[PDB]
Amino acid sequence: QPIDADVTVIGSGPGGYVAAIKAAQLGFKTVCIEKNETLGGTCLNVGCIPSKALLNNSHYYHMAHGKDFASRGIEMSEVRLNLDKMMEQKSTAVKALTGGIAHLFKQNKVVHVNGYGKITGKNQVTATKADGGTQVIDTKNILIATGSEVTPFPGITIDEDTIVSSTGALSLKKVPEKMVVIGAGVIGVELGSVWQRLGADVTAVEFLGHVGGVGIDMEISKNFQRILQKQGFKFKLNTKVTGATKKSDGKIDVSIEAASGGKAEVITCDVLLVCIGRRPFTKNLGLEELGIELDPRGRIPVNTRFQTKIPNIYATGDVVAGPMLAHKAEDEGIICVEGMAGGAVHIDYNCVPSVIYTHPEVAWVGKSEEQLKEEGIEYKVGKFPFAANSRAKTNADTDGMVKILGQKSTDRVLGAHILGPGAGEMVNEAALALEYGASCEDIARVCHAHPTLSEAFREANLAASFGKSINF
Amino acid sequence: QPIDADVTVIGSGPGGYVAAIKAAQLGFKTVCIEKNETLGGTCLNVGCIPSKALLNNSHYYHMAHGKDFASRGIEMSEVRLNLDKMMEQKSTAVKALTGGIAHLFKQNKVVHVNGYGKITGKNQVTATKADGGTQVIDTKNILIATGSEVTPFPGITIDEDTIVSSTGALSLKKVPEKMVVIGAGVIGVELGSVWQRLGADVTAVEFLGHVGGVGIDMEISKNFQRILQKQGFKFKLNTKVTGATKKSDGKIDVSIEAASGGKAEVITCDVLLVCIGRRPFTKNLGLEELGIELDPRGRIPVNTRFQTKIPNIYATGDVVAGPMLAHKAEDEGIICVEGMAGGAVHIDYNCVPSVIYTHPEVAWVGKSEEQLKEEGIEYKVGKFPFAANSRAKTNADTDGMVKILGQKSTDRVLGAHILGPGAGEMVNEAALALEYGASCEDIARVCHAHPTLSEAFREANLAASFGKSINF
Ligand SMILES: Cc1cc2nc3c(=O)[nH]c(=O)nc-3n(C[C@H](O)[C@H](O)[C@H](O)COP(=O)(O)OP(=O)(O)OC[C@H]3O[C@@H](n4cnc5c(N)ncnc54)[C@H](O)[C@@H]3O)c2cc1C
Ligand SMILES: Cc1cc2nc3c(=O)[nH]c(=O)nc-3n(C[C@H](O)[C@H](O)[C@H](O)COP(=O)(O)OP(=O)(O)OC[C@H]3O[C@@H](n4cnc5c(N)ncnc54)[C@H](O)[C@@H]3O)c2cc1C
C-alpha cells in the first residue's frame, strides 16, 4: 500500500525531473512527486518554453511587419496576426514536451505520484492527492525540488486577467494597446519585447539603474537598452512604483515616482505585468517540523553534496541558493544524485551562463567588469563588433559586440559577454572554455569556421591576448 | 620603382589578406598583390559571402511562401519576389566586406599593389597591371596565396549565361523554371537549394552516391538527402554526364548516363550549373622557372612551416593541400607568418570544421564513421534528435540530429556530425573540444544553457559516454 524506494524527488521541475531520470539510470529506485497536472514545472508549463516560443514568433512577425523581409526582396502585403495560432504553437510545443518527460519517466522506470508532498518523517514522504487520499512513500533519501514562485509586489494582486504575472502574460487573449511592466529583469524585458512587436505600447519600470537583472555588464546593459529603446521599448528606470488602481475604465492607473521621490507621475495601461522577481517555494512541506530553518531569502541552505542539516534529505534547484536558471537546477540535480551514488560534487557557478532570448540576444559567462572591479582583479578588455563579423553582415544582423575580459598576467578568460545575434548558442562555447580554464590566446588559436558568428568570439579573445584583432 | 619589403603576399584571398595583416602586426614590411579590382578573393566576391547571403534570404522567402510563418499565426496575403532586391543585399554585403579589408590594409600599413604577380626571382616579385608601371618588389620572403579556380567540365564550355558555374549561378537575373546542377557537393547543394526555394525544378547529377562531397558521414548525407528531397530537391546520384548542348531555343540538353551503364536519359533545363569541384591556380606564376614542381593535383608541395622547395618562398591556402576551405587558409596564413617571426607552426586538419549553410544545416568536424572503419578504429556512437531539444521544438525546427563518435576505450571525441538547426555555430564548440582533446564525458559534464540547441551536443556526448541520455 505504501511505496518503498531509495530516492524520492519532490518536484518535476528541471532540477527534479532530470535527477529522477539520472538516479533511475544509476540503479536507485526513484520516485517523483508532482502536484500540478502537467509535469516540467515552471520552465515547461509557464516558463522558458512558452516565453521562448512567443519570442521566436514575435520576431518573425516584426520582420514581416517591418522593412526586414522587403529589404531582402521578400515583398508581402497585408501582414496580419492571428494570435490564436501563435498561442496554439506555444501550447503545442509545451504539450509535446510535457509528454516527453512522461515517456522518459516511463522508459527510465521512474514512479510518478500526482500529489502534494510533505516530508512526514526523516525517511518518509506523504503525498496528498486531490481526492484527499494520501500516498506514503518510505525512502532512504529525499530530494527537495519544490521550485519557485512569483514575488508579489506590495499593494498589487495579480488577477491573471489584466494584472498578470508571467503565467498570465503568456496567455493574453488580445494584444494590449498599452502595457506597463514592473521589473526590467530577464523575464520582464523578454515578455515586453514579445507584445511590443505585436503593437503594444510597452513601458518598463525599474527601481534600479540598469536593465537585464543581476550579473550584466554595465556597458552591455546600456547598449542593450539603447537597441531596445529604438525597437519601441520605453524604459522608466530609477523609478519607484507607488501604487495602482483597477479603474472602472477597464484600464489600470499606475502611479510611479522617482527613487528620490522628486517626480511623481501616473501612467495608465490596459495590462499590468508584475515581474519584480521570483522566490523560493517552500510552502506546506514539513521543514519546520524537521527542524531545518530557511535563510533570509527563504532558501534551503545546503553543503557541497547538496544536503541539508538532515543528511539523507537533499535539496537542489531554485530552492537552494545560486542563479535561479533552468540549466543550473538540472546540473545540481545530476551532481547531487551522483554524489548519492558516490561522486565528487563540485559545481562552479561562475561557469554558469545566462541568456536573454531577446533579439538582439544578450548572453554572458563569467564576471562582469564591475564584479572584477569589486574583487580588485585587474583585467584587459577585448571587443569585436558584429558589424565586422562576416556572417552578421551577410545576414544583415549587425547589432552588438562580443566583450572578452582576461586577467592582465595570466591572460585567463575571466568573463565573456555577448550582445547580438546567436549569443545563446555562443556562451556554451565560452562555458566550455571557462571550464577548461582557457586563456584568451587558447581560444584565439582554435580553428573557427567562416563565415560564422563565432569568429567574433575568437577575434575578441585575440583582441585581448594580442592587443589587436585581425578584422577590427 | 622598386619596393623593398620583408614579406610579400601574392593574393588577396582569405589566406593572403589575413596573413598580410598579421605579418604587418608582427613588424614586417608586408606587401600584398591582387590582380582583380576587388580584394577579398573568391570567398568574399564570388564565394562564401554571396552564397550565404542568398541562402539566408531565400530561406526567409520559402518560409513566407509556405506554411512556416502562418503556422505561427504570421498571416500574409500575397508573397512576391523582387529578385533585384535580394541580389542587392548580396552585393551590398560583399561591397561592405570588401571595403573592410581596405581599411584594415591601410590601418596596419599593408601595401596594396593591384597587378598580376609573377615571381621573377628568389627575392623578387614583379606585378604587371593591365597598363602601368610593372612594379618590382624586392622582398625577403614570398607567400603564394594564389588560390583556386573553377574546375572545368571536359566537353562542356562554361558560358556563364546559361552554362554557369559558381559565379554565374550567384548572379542570375531571373529564376530558371528548371535548373540542373553538375556536382552534388557543398557548393552544389547550397546553390541548388537557393533557386529551388525561389522556385525551380532543380536536379543534381552526381557520379558519386552521396551528397555533400567528400568527408560527409553516410548516415548524415543520407538523412540530409531525405529532407532535401521532401523540400523539392531532385537527385540523380550514381549518374555520369556525357554531353551538354545549347539549342536555338536557348535551352540546354544534358546527356546523362548511369555510370555502370544503361539508364541513358536526356535532361532539358534553362540553366546548367557546373560545380564538379575546384582546382588550385598557379598559372603565370614563374614556378617552372624557379624550379618549384607541383604534385599531380597541381597543388604546391609545402612542409610543416609551409615552405616550398626554396625556403623563402612559402605557400598557403587552396593552392596547397588540405580541405579547400577559407578558415583553413586563414589559419594557414597566420601560422605561416608567425613561423617567419620564429613561432612554432602546428596545424591539425582533423579539428578543421566543415559547414553546409543550407536549411537544414550540415556541419561536422573530426572523422566520419566510414573513415574510422577505414583506419580500424573502434568507436562508440551517440545520437540526440533535435526533435527532443527544447529550443528546436520551441522554434519548430524539429529536423536532424547530433552524432558523436568516441573511441570505445579512451572515450575521446573522434568526430562530431551535426545535421539541423544552428549546426554552423554549434560545430565551433566541438572544434574547441577537439583542440583541447576532450572526451565525450568532458563535454557532457559542462553546463549547457536551457533552452539552447547546444544541449543536443551535450546530450549526444552523454549518449556516447553513459550510453543513455537524459532527455532521450
Ligand atoms: C517566464 C519565465 C521564463 C524563463 N526563462 C528561462 C530561460 O530562458 N532560461 C532559464 O535558464 N531559466 C528560465 N526561467 C527560469 C526557470 O524556469 C527556473 O529557474 C526553473 O524552471 C526552476 O527549477 P526548479 O525545478 O527548481 O523549479 P520548478 O520548475 O518550479 O519545479 C518545482 C515543481 O515542483 C512542484 N512542487 C512544488 N512543491 C511540491 C510539493 N510539495 N509536492 C509536489 N510537487 C511540488 C511545483 O508545482 C513545480 O511543478 C524562466 C522562468 C520564467 C517564469
Ligand atoms: C559558392 C562557394 C561557397 C563557398 N563556401 C565556403 C564556406 O562556407 N566556407 C569555406 O571555408 N569555404 C567556402 N568556399 C571556398 C572558399 O571560397 C575558398 O576555400 C577560399 O576562398 C580560398 O582561399 P585562398 O586563400 O586560396 O583565397 P583565394 O581567393 O582562392 O585566392 C586567390 C586570390 O588571389 C588572386 N590572385 C590569383 N592569381 C594572382 C596573381 N598572379 N597576382 C595577384 N593576385 C592573384 C585572385 O584574384 C584571388 O583574389 C566556397 C566557395 C564557393 C565557390
Residue numbers in the entry:
A (entry chain A), B (entry chain B): 3 to 474
Sentences from the study reporting this entry:
Dihydrolipoamide dehydrogenase (LADH, E3) is a mitochondrial flavoenzyme operating as one of the components of the α-keto acid dehydrogenase multienzyme complexes (the pyruvate dehydrogenase (PDH), the α-ketoglutarate dehydrogenase (KGDH), the α-ketoadipate dehydrogenase (KADH), and the branched chain α-keto acid dehydrogenase (BCKDH) complexes (c)) and the glycine cleavage system. The role of LADH is to regenerate the catalytic activity of the above complexes by oxidizing their E2-subunit-bound lipoic acid (LA) prosthetic group and simultaneously reducing an NAD+ co-substrate. The LADH reaction is governed by the ping-pong bi–bi mechanism, which is structurally supported by two separate substrate-binding sites; the dihydrolipoamide substrate is oxidized on the si face, while the NAD+ co-substrate is reduced on the re face of the isoalloxazine ring of the FAD prosthetic group. The LADH/E3 component is a functional (obligate) homodimer since residues from both of the monomers have catalytic roles in each active site in this dimeric enzyme; the redox-active disulfide bond (Cys45–Cys50; the numbering reflects the sequence of the mature human (h) enzyme) resides in one of the monomers, while the catalytic base His452′ is part of the adjacent monomer (indicated by ′).
The I318T substitution altered the specific LADH activities in both catalytic directions (79 and 51% residual activities in the forward and reverse directions, respectively) and induced less than 20% FAD loss in the recombinant enzyme, even though the residue Ile318 resides in the FAD-binding region in hLADH. This residue in hLADH is involved in the formation of a β-sheet structure that interacts with the FAD at several points (mostly at the β-turn segments) and is also proximal to the entrance of the NAD+/NADH-binding pocket and residues that directly participate in NAD+/NADH binding (Met326, among others). The residue Ile318 itself coordinates a H2O molecule through its carbonyl oxygen (along with Val321(N) and Gly149(N)), which in turn interacts with one of the phosphates in FAD. Thus, the residue Ile318 likely plays a role in FAD coordination in hLADH. However, the crystal structure of I318T-hLADH revealed no significant structural alterations throughout the structure that support our biochemical/functional results, at least in the forward (physiologically more relevant) direction. In the mutant structure, H2O molecules could hardly be modeled (due likely to the high B-factors), even in the highly conserved positions near the FAD; therefore, no conclusions could be drawn regarding the effects of the substitution on the above detailed H2O-mediated interaction with the FAD. In the active site, minor dislocations of the His452 and Glu457 side chains could be observed. As a result, these two side chains moved apart by a fraction of an angstrom, perhaps also weakening their otherwise crucial interaction.
